[PDB]
Amino acid sequence: MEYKSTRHAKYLCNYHFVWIPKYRRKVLTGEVAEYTKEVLRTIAEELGCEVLALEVMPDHIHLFVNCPPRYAPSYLANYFKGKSARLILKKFQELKKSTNGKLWTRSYFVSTSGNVSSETIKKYIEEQWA
Amino acid sequence: MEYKSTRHAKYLCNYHFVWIPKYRRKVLTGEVAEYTKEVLRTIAEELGCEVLALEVMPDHIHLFVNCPPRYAPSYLANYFKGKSARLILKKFQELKKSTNGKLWTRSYFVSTSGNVSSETIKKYIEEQWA
């Protein structure tokens, strides 16, 4: 698709993150559903990532993102999860109390994406040699 | 594709790294090209990454690795390149001379690979409940 590039590196790192709430389905809904969409969208940009897709559901979150090369997928997962937890619960005191603190589980799913043409490889090379 | 699992994360992280040497004059070939293809394999197993394709043409390396979520693309890119430089130079002192410790330029190309289908996502959500 389209490639970002510092003089560091010409890169394209697309990750799908996917994770679930700690207690089933009395949570990600209504204002809660939307603030969650707000906060992650801006955590994404706080780091320099781009939201490519983001669906929130009462059973799960699925956050598809483009991200600078300095970030480990693990760091990213724990970051989105970590800081969304803090935000949501300080914005919905109700939740904090009945989720006993634990809004997420300590598990996550991450999957890379993109299917790289042997043409752009050539491009990088030639526009490197020059 | 093939999805791996630690205690607290399910992952697939396929990256294509591409980088170049400074000089050209049959610098990556035969004697070298064989060791290059062999040290990167080594370094890959040193990190827990597992090589999915690796090609060494005089003009470019194209390593295609699947890696643990704990490594950031940068850290890997500098790791393969930096660590391979250090060895190749050692057992090819002739080239260390006709180069002055300058095996690669300080740029690189990384790109993610992999799809995600809905089936995949549900399956993960669906097995995280029990």
Handedness of CA A84, A85, A87, A91 (dihedral sign): positive
Residues in chain A with CB shorter than 8 Å from the CB of B13 are: 73, 110-112
Residue A25 has phi, psi (to 5 degrees) of -130, 45
**Structure obtained using:** X-ray
Kindly list the distances between the CA atom of residue A85 and the CA atoms of A95, A130, B20, B41, in Å, as whole numbers in the listed order.
10, 47, 43, 40
Asked if B15's CB is within 8 angstroms of A110's CB, the reply is: no
Q: How far is B122 from chain A (nearest CA, A)?
A: 9
> Is B75 tagged catalytic?
no
* Maximum C-alpha span of chain B: 61
Strands A14-19 and A108-113 turn out to be antiparallel
Cα within 13 Å of Cα(A10), Cβ side: 16
- Cβ proximity of B111 and B16 under 8 Å: yes
Handedness of CA B95, B99, B102, B104 (dihedral sign): negative
Q: So what CATH class is B1-130?
A: alpha beta
Domain ranges of chain A: 1-130
d(CA A55, CA B39): 42
